[PDB]
Amino acid sequence: DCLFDGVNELMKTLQFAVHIPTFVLGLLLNLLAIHGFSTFLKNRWPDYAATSIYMINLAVFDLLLVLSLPFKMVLSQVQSPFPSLCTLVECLYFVSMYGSVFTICFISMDRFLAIRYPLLVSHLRSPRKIFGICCTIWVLVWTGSIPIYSFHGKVEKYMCFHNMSDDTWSAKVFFPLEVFGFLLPMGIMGFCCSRSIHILLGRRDHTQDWVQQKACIYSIAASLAVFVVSFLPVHLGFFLQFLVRNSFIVECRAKQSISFFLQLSMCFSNVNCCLDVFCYYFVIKEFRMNI
Amino acid sequence: VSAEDKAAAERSKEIDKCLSREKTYVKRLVKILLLGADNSGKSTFLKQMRIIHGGIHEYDFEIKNVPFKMVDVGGQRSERKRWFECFDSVTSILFLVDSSDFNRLTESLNDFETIVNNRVFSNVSIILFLNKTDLLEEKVQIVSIKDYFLEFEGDPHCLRDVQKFLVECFRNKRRDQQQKPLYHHFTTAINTENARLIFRDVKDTILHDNLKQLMLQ
Amino acid sequence: DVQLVESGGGLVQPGGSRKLSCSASGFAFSSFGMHWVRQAPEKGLEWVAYISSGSGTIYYADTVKGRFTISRDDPKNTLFLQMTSLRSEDTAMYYCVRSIYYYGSSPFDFWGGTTLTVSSGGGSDIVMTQATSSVPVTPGESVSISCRSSKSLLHSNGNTYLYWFLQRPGQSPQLLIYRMSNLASGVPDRFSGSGSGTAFTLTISRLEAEDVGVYYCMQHLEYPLTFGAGTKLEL
Amino acid sequence: SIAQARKLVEQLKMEANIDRIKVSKAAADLMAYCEAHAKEDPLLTPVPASENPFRE
Amino acid sequence: ELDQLRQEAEQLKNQIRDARKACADATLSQITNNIDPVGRIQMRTRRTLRGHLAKIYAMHWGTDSRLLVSASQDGKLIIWDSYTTNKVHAIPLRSSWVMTCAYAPSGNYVACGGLDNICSIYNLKTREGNVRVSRELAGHTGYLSCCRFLDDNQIVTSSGDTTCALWDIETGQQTTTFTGHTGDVMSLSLAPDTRLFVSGACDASAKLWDVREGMCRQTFTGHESDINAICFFPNGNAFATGSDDATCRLFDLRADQELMTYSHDNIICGITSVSFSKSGRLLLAGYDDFNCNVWDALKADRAGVLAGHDNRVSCLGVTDDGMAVATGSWDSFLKIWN
Ligand SMILES: Cc1cccc(N2CCN(C(=O)c3cc(S(=O)(=O)N(C)C)ccc3N3CCCC3)CC2)c1C
Ligand SMILES: *[C@@H]1O[C@H](CO)[C@@H](O[C@@H]2O[C@H](CO)[C@@H](O)[C@H](O)[C@H]2NC(C)=O)[C@H](O)[C@H]1NC(C)=O
Ligand SMILES: CC(C)CCC[C@@H](C)[C@H]1CC[C@H]2[C@@H]3CC=C4C[C@@H](O)CC[C@]4(C)[C@H]3CC[C@]12C
């Protein structure tokens, strides 16, 4: 009724071939990003302090995912020396993923708020509030991971990312995870990006210099496109694997393909650690002038 | 420290509290440097604004609970650097032009070029008010625009063509265009919608500042 | 004209309560610290309370601590002293004193007066001693008044917080010398102030009939503010 | 025109009538003043921290 | 007749230049060549005076070398205790466009002025305990650029109307007017003896005036741009001036000509302020490049730099005892250096 041997070996080959270049590229890309935005923080604080803080936050989450990647590559094909090392590696990896997701969402919401309410944001926006929001993001991801990974005691996983228990995949835990990690973030991101673009396009009525902000429109559109490409298929695979676990898709060759798609999409989801750099940091003229 | 030193430190702390209290207000204050001319209708425009909304001359008013400060430097207008850098932190410059008087356009355009091309006013937006538009539309039929501007192309008696030509000549004087927005309005001093237009332009300038802060490009 | 007018004093039974008020006019009351100073009948000055220009710090004398309350109403320019459980030792004449505190200011430069009478029904404190109680002298002849402090009033910042006051018969005290050397505004140059770390002298070059009264030395080095016994000066 | 020209000519004549010492004498006097007061300049010679009321 | 007057003026200028050249025999650099260098000077920010809400335009030390007054674009005059950083007074101004301030030598008054064309006198020792305006000197048709007290009753102001004026504060009228500058007067310095004062204007010239007689004693023209600052040598026989041409210059009264030029190739920004140390050995100049340069006044060598401000250094000041230096900047901060 089921078999996942060839799927597992093909996925091992593909995950090596995708995660090695992803690790290598993301390492230097995020180190360069952190260096550049730290230079901005120490050089041009009054005008770029609030944005640089959450840019560094996103870069640090991406770098944490990059550093957890080699453990994912090795531990998924070799026996775990300790029973709980797999849980720690998984926690670091997924906390990095979802912290990056929430940082991206907060960036989009900040941009939309600044565009839609320029006076209020000009009065209220400050580096300390952005720093507090970043701290809240870190606290939320890290204190949401613990109540989830505490139940991974009955898993009995000799290799990581292979043996997930019906504690996080039950509806009462799976569906809130999907809603609060993908569905709500994607809805917020789509609304915020679309409204920002609509408002920036509506400036033809006030001034003929609205064409100066076409690049901002392109950047926001690229942010939406990169978010959808990097995080939609992986959660589609999560939902599909949920359907397999609940016997909605039971006939063979469909469970194997769903597992292969889930693993491959999770491998390609982590490419966002470089797509984030290209989408948020290299679009900045000053950042690319520094580099 | 002694008791009198402690009490002096208390007095300094109270002064600090007053200064910090006043700091919030000055952050939300919008300063506009008025640079009209004698024929531009500056006096009538200011009188209308004062009626509707209740050295150097200053006019303080409020639009949508936003404190506005119009600085009038009529007469006491200098060309030295020190005088100019006094206004380097104003939000925008309101340039008033009599659009009907075709004879004086060249001097007005030269003054506009000198004002908007100053490196001091690089972080301020420009609000251009072409006053006496009724006189302009009465004069366009009688007098051809091509007489004073051979570069004008279009129907001499078409009001829209003349307005477009005036706006283009004023916008073309701005050598550097990718720094701050420029806004132009065709209105009259007696018009009661000038404050709304000024507030809209200031809101767009602040939106531009917010966009620059976000490092979106 | 600067004026401090006090009211609320009167005959009070022991254990009762009273509220002294002081209306301030002719000066910026909000920027001045205020002191309450009382003088028992046929006795010297005794500081009782202090409230700063705002209300951040409030100081009381140990004798009135826990019983007296000092307060101010800046919009009304009024100073208040709420007394409770009054004893016979509270019978005195209470004055309020302006005291502004910045570099070069002159604290204790204006006084008032009001009288409270109650019916029949300190360690670390700096001791200020005026050796002579009465100096009989004639007009036109120079006089010198001495005062001694147990602790050195000179501070590491270079100031010597010693004050001289003159109280003419039937009049409120007026500042003569502030910080041991500085002449108060409106005081004739015939008054001079000299002293050392612990010993101080006040010299009057040419005696006049207006100089007759009691001279007080007060320290402002630390609270509580303590006065000398007072030296009389009569013809 | 003529009045301002006469005024400026008179001013120039007043400027020309002054007696000017040699540049060497002025330089020597400036050096002598600087050398005489060198010991009394706190900025030129950093004073000991004890005699500094601005020590932080 | 006009051509004859122009020719006479040109001949007088040529004769003055010839006399100045004849009196020039040996340069100050040659005379001071054998003197040992001052050496590198490293002053540090001893205090930072914060509290202003906008750019600081002017500052003046009190004669006690402890109190100073500062003028800022937020329409505020603040008197500081430099030793303790404490704020003694905070004086609101009717006009926020202040450009100069002064401290009376007695410490009883401060002066204010700017784009309102009025020199305002504020009384600091009032029986009411508050600072109130004591006098409003009007009569200048241009903005006020500098003001300096002679005593409690006399003050000298410079204006953008190309004139300087001596005022009697009690009557409020100009006792004397000083004319001859063809450009906006930017700065003025009083001689230590108070008998003379020197002025620098936008016509790239410096004029020495006699306060009593009221006429121009001498004119100095070596700069190629607007003069923004001017200061007297401690003995009163020389003065230094800084201009927009990225150059400071020292002029001698008796020699009636320039003695030394303080400039560097790396320096292209204009000079906002100049000041001498107590002995006159050090000339401190403020620049638009956010830094203050310490010059050896005798050797024209940059002996040090004060770099602690995030914006343009607008004002400078050395105490009467020479112990400290105050620097004001457009970043709304005052710094005491040592
Ligand atoms: C914010 C945060 C922090 C840490 C973990 C998570 N969470 C919950 C725990 N996590 C899983 O059970 C999980 C694991 C894997 S797999 O890679 O290890 N492998 C294939 C079995 C795949 C999907 C997973 N989940 C996503 C849907 C529900 C379950 C990962 C996502 C979150 C949302
Ligand atoms: C997933 O869990 C199963 C158990 O649910 C693991 O299978 C065990 O494998 C060990 C050796 O690794 C055997 O000793 C046990 O008998 C097996 N148990 C069962 C119930 O078959 C399996 O190895 C785990 N897979 C991974 C990839 O860690
Ligand atoms: C994405 C991160 C930062 C947010 C984490 C919060 C959400 C997604 C997770 C974290 C822990 C989860 C809970 C874990 C356990 C329980 C108890 C169970 O009886 C009902 C479901 C419930 C209550 C889960 C609902 C979803 C939940 C609240």
Residue numbers in the entry:
A (entry chain R): 9 to 299
B (entry chain A): 5 to 58, 68 to 230
C (entry chain F): 1 to 121, 133 to 246
D (entry chain G): 8 to 63
E (entry chain B): 21 to 358
Q: What did the original publication write about this model?
A:
GPR55 is an orphan G protein-coupled receptor (GPCR) and represents a promising drug target for cancer, inflammation, and metabolic diseases. Here, we determine high-resolution cryo-electron microscopy structures of the activated GPR55 in complex with heterotrimeric G13 and two structurally diverse ligands: the putative endogenous agonist 1-palmitoyl-2-lysophosphatidylinositol (LPI) and the synthetic agonist ML184. Notably, an orthosteric binding site opening towards the membrane is observed in both structures, enabling direct interaction of the agonists with membrane lipids. The two structures of GPR55 were determined in the G protein-bound active state and are highly similar with an RMSD of 1.91 Å considering all atoms and 1.42 Å within the G protein heterotrimer.
The synthetic agonist ML184 binds to the hydrophobic cavity that is populated by the palmitoyl tail in the LPI-bound structure. Accordingly, the binding mode of the synthetic agonist ML184 is characterized by hydrophobic contacts and aromatic stacking interactions. The phenyl ring adjacent to the sulfonamide forms multiple face-to-edge aromatic stacking interactions with F1023.33, W1775.34, as well as F2466.55 and is additionally stabilized by contacts to M172ECL2 and M2747.39. The sidechain of T1765.33 adopts a different rotamer in the ML184 structure (rotated by approximately 90°) and forms a direct hydrogen bond with the amide carbonyl of ML184. The pyrrolidine moiety of ML184 addresses a lipophilic sub-pocket formed by W1775.34, F1825.39, L1855.42, and F2466.55. The terminal dimethylphenyl ring is stabilized by aromatic stacking interactions with Y1063.37 and Y1574.61 and points towards the same membrane opening between helices IV and V as observed for the lipid tail in the LPI-bound structure. Direct interaction of R2536.62 with ML184 was not observed.
